């Protein structure tokens, strides 16, 4: 099934995936942020998504931002039934401030397949 989304404001950008077999859709900041050194920011995308059945959506790092600028992505687990505004929690572990501009790609969204098991307690395994 498809990944669907809707744009919660005009500042949102539709996620894109250039390559057919790329693991994730690019997520774009809907706003300017300045993240000082050793600080975190929630970067809003102003999109809502409806994930396909049988996965969650992992908000995962973009490789170049980590290797060049020491940016990481925190949190990241979007439940299959989440319909709120997707926020990317960015961590700037670098020594200088990191600027996000509206329309910058700042993370990717991977549809990771998972089980939804029932849980059972036993005395010992």
């Amino acid at each position: 099934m498809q990944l669907r989304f809707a744009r919660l404001s005009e500042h949102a950008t539709a996620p894109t995936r250039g390559s057919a077999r790329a693991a994730g859709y690019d997520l774009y900041s809907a706003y300017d942020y300045t993240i000082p050194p050793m600080e975190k920011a929630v970067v809003k995308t102003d999109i809502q998504i409806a994930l396909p059945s049988g996965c969650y959506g992992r908000v995962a790092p973009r490789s170049g931002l980590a290797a060049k600028h020491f940016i990481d992505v925190g949190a990241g687990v979007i439940d299959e039934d989440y319909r709120g505004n997707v926020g990317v929690v960015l961590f700037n572990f670098g020594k200088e401030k990191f600027e996000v501009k509206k329309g910058d790609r700042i993370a990717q969204l991977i549809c990771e397949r998972i089980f939804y098991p029932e849980i059972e307690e036993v005395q010992a395994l």
Copy 2:
């Protein structure tokens, strides 16, 4: 396609999942920990788990603890055959200490589906 667990001591709390389609089961600390700024702790759950076949268990961040308190989860890959005490490695990148009380939810456990491929070397792909 059940997740089974056992309590290794009476300090453990059975993992829970509120929504049927949340990605993960909440893991609870069995102990109090104080994590100073820019430090790590291994927080013990005092549970052992038996993951379903075809996945590993990812210990992943709770979204709120990351966006509000700059808490991140390190390590996180529990192999399908692991039967030891589940430990959550918490990183506090905040400027203030972070208190874990016994019984606090500190991470979530996601059953992520994976392959177990054989490996082969070639001269060049």
Copy 3:
């Protein structure tokens, strides 16, 4: 349901997985690196890989390095069609430098199953 790889230099070490049900294959450094406290390094494996169809390759942390040495892995999303040198972005959040010696295992490679959905914009969910 083969993972295929090729060595790009003679400094590369073939990835290994000791347990049949371990989530990932060990990745080994091709070089010596010294990572200062609160810094990062891109550790080259000098291998290229060809992932099985239906997954991407997560470069994930080794549990012991995170809980003992405060090492974490950045980036980590290797697309199914990536044929370049696999680099591991290591973050040293410890107060002491961390030494990587050529031949050390520095991360694991997990074949995470994923969907590759088409994307559809709707006016609202």
